[PDB]
C-alpha cells in the first residue's frame, strides 16, 4: 500500500515535474521502445521515430493520467476507472509491460530530478508506479 510518507514523497517529486509531464512522458516511452523493443508490438500504428507527434501526444496523455493519479492518490481505482476499463477490455496490453514502462518512467525522473530523487523518494516512486500499474490491470480478468 502507499504509506502516507510515500504519498508525500510522490506529491513533492511529481509536483516538480509540473509543466514538463508531456516531455517526460514522451522520453519515458522512447526509453521503453529502445530498451525493450517487444513493447513496440503495441504501437505498430504509430510513427515511433524520435520526436514524433504521436509519441509526444501519447507521452502527454500518460503523464496527465499520472498527474490525475497523484492528485487522487487515496482513491486511484476510482480516479483511473475509465483507463483501467480501456486497458482491460480494448488495449489488452500484457501486464508484464507495465513494469517496463514503470522502470523507464523512474529512469526519466531520476535523469531530470537530481535534487529530489533520494533513496526514499526512489522507493516511493517505484511503489507508486507499481500501484498505478496494479490499478490499470485490475479488471483484465
Amino acid at each position: 500500500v502507499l504509506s502516507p510518507a510515500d504519498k508525500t514523497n510522490v506529491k513533492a517529486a511529481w509536483g516538480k515535474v509540473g509543466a514538463h509531464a508531456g516531455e517526460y512522458g514522451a522520453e519515458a516511452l522512447e526509453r521503453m521502445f529502445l530498451s525493450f523493443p517487444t513493447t513496440k508490438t503495441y504501437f505498430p500504428h504509430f510513427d515511433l521515430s524520435h520526436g514524433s507527434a504521436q509519441v509526444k501526444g501519447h507521452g502527454k496523455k500518460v503523464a496527465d493520467a499520472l498527474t490525475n493519479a497523484v492528485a487522487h492518490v487515496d482513491d486511484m481505482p476510482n480516479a483511473l476507472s475509465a483507463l483501467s476499463d480501456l486497458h482491460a477490455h480494448k488495449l489488452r496490453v500484457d501486464p508484464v509491460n507495465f513494469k517496463l514502462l514503470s522502470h523507464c518512467l523512474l529512469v526519466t525522473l531520476a535523469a531530470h530530478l537530481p535534487a529530489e530523487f533520494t533513496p526514499a523518494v526512489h522507493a516511493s516512486l517505484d511503489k507508486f508506479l507499481a500501484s498505478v500499474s496494479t490499478v490499470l490491470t485490475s479488471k483484465y480478468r
Binding site: 523493443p37 517487444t38 513493447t39 508490438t41 505498430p44 489488452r92 496490453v93 501486464p95 480478468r141
Partner: protein, 145 residues
C-alpha cells in the same frame, strides 16, 4: 540445456500427444485463462464464454497449426533459434505479437499435458517440458527488434 534423460522424457510423452487436439485445447485455454490474449483473434468469431472459446472451430484450427509448428520444433531441440527464426520474424514484423504470449501459451500447454496425462506427467517430465516451452518461446522472440 535438456539432459539426455530430459530429451527422452520429452520424446516419449510426445509420442502419445494428439497434436491437433492438444493444440486446440491449449490455445482455447490460453484465451479463457488470459482473456486479453483474445486481442490477436478478433476475426475468429464467438469468444464470449469458455464453452464458446473451447468449441470455436477457428480456435481449434489455429491451435492445430500452432502446436503443429511446435511439434516440428521438437525434432530440432539443439537448434530452436534457427528452427523458429522465420516464424519469429513473422510474429514480430507482421503479426505484432508480444513474445510474453509465447510464455503464457507454454504454461497453459504444461497445464494441459498435466491434466490430460495425470500421474505420468511427473515432476521430472514437467521439468523437461518447462525447458522446452522456455526454449521455444525464447526462439520465437529472438528475431524481434
Amino acid at each position: 540445456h535438456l539432459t539426455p534423460e530430459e530429451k527422452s522424457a520429452v520424446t516419449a510423452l510426445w509420442g502419445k500427444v494428439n497434436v491437433d487436439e492438444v493444440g486446440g485445447e491449449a490455445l482455447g485455454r490460453l484465451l479463457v485463462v488470459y482473456p486479453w490474449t483474445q486481442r490477436f483473434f478478433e476475426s475468429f468469431g464467438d469468444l464470449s464464454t469458455p464453452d464458446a472459446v473451447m468449441g470455436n472451430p477457428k480456435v481449434k484450427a489455429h491451435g492445430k497449426k500452432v502446436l503443429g509448428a511446435f511439434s516440428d520444433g521438437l525434432a530440432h531441440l539443439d537448434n530452436l533459434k534457427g528452427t523458429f527464426a522465420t516464424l519469429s520474424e513473422l510474429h514480430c514484423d507482421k503479426l505484432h505479437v508480444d513474445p510474453e504470449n509465447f510464455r503464457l501459451l507454454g504454461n497453459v500447454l504444461v497445464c494441459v499435458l498435466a491434466h490430460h496425462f495425470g500421474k505420468e506427467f511427473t515432476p521430472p517430465v514437467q521439468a523437461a517440458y518447462q525447458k522446452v516451452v522456455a526454449g521455444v518461446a525464447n526462439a520465437l522472440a529472438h528475431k524481434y527488434h
